[PDB]
Design a binder for this molecule. Structure first.
Ligand code: HEM
Length: 154
């Protein structure tokens, strides 16, 4: 699939807002993911023991993980589709080391959309959300293809 320049502009416009507070968006997104799909928390051995949202909000390890997720995703989005190089090591670690099914990438994609919708209603209208969804679908499609080449595709 291919996004138009206009769609990339909508994506990068709201992303510039996200970058004003990377750590805060990172926390919100991961907490949303864990509350909606608790099974996903089990993959993070470092903080798999957190029981409540209050504990999650207080965790420095979870905040750092959120910053890591957003910084990596931001680098990918700014490539505007020319992200083959950035995707290789990411697909390898998530398929082979962490063992993250595509299903979970769909779950985090939904958490990202929910948080942007909550925090940036003025810059995340229907057209902007459609463009962000398309960009994340492109990301998931290319990652799924790499998973298969690596012997996982789970
Ligand atoms: C947009 C989605 C994602 C991005 C861009 C991303 C990015 C990263 C990055 C850059 C790291 C650091 C080095 C490495 O590759 O190991 C990492 C680690 C990890 N990721 Fe992801 N990730 C994503 C989604 C997920 C999901 C959905 C899960 C689990 C449900 C997950 C679980 C992990 C785990 C377990 C680690 C290592 C934690 C640690 O450092 O101890 N990732 N991810």
């Amino acid at each position: 699939m291919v996004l138009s320049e206009g769609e990339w502009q909508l994506v990068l416009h709201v992303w510039a807002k996200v970058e004003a507070d990377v750590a805060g968006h990172g926390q919100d997104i991961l907490i949303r993911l864990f509350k909606s799909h608790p099974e996903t928390l089990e993959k993070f051995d470092r903080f798999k023991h957190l029981k409540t949202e209050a504990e999650m909000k207080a965790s420095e390890d979870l905040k750092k993980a959120g910053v890591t997720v957003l910084t990596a995703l931001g680098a990918i989005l700014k490539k505007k589709g020319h992200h083959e190089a950035e995707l290789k090591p990411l697909a390898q670690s998530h398929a082979t080391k962490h063992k993250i099914p595509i299903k979970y990438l769909e779950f985090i994609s939904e958490a990202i959309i929910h948080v942007l919708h909550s925090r940036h209603p003025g810059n995340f209208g229907a057209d902007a959300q459609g463009a962000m969804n398309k960009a994340l679908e492109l990301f998931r499609k290319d990652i799924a293809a790499k998973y298969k080449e690596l012997g996982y595709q789970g």
